[PDB]
């Protein structure tokens, strides 16, 4: 798995690969790792499929009830907090590396990392999953302050394409989502649509 999220002015971009593995068999080639928690709050999931699905279902329930009680859209920081609380409390029994990202009217576009162990930290952009090791350099060199939405989508698809190339545990299609005040725009980059970089054959 490789997952990623980027803040822009007005929203967020999220991305994931689509590979689920048991050992080195691919149980799902077209997995959807970007799950909606509310109208405009997504989580990107890495680690145990069972764990991240169960945790995401539980936070969805918690947040939906919270949101009806307050009669207001939920804060992204509140979604992240609920993930943090459950991932920290059950850290010895869970294997989950989460990115929470979305939009709310109060703080706009936000990205929160809740890595294994259950800390929470807000970031300009976040990467996680096994494959993220292979793109720290790239994203450190490429990330620019002030990127537009389209630039964030391109950046995200590039980074994930690179990780997917090298990480045996990542692969398949790239799933992207953009979240802003106006709503959620989802898409799939597959086959020739995935950014390509030459294998470095010999002169």
């Amino acid at each position: 798995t490789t997952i990623m999220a980027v803040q822009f002015d007005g929203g967020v971009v999220l991305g994931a690969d689509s590979r689920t593995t048991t050992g080195s068999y691919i149980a799902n080639r077209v997995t959807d790792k970007l799950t909606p928690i509310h109208d405009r709050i997504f989580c990107c999931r890495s680690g145990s499929a069972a764990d991240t699905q169960a945790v995401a279902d539980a936070v969805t329930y918690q947040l939906g009830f919270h949101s009806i009680e307050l009669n207001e859209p939920p804060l992204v920081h509140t979604a992240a907090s609920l993930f943090k609380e459950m991932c920290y409390r059950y850290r010895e029994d869970l294997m989950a590396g989460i990115i929470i990202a979305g939009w709310d009217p109060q703080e706009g576009g936000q990205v929160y990392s809740v890595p294994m162990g259950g800390m929470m930290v807000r970031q300009s952009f976040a990467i996680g999953g096994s494959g993220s090791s292979y793109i720290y350099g790239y994203v450190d060199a490429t990330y620019r302050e002030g990127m537009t939405k389209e630039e964030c989508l391109q950046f995200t698809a590039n980074a994930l394409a690179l990780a997917m190339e090298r990480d045996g545990s990542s692969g398949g299609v790239i799933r992207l989502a953009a979240i802003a005040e106006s709503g959620v725009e989802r898409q799939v980059l597959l086959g020739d649509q995935i950014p390509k970089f030459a294998v470095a054959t010999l002169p």
């Binding site: 145990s48 069972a50 999953g129």
Partner: peptide
């Protein structure tokens, strides 16, 4: 087990 089964991971992402």
């Amino acid at each position: 087990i089964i991971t992402x």
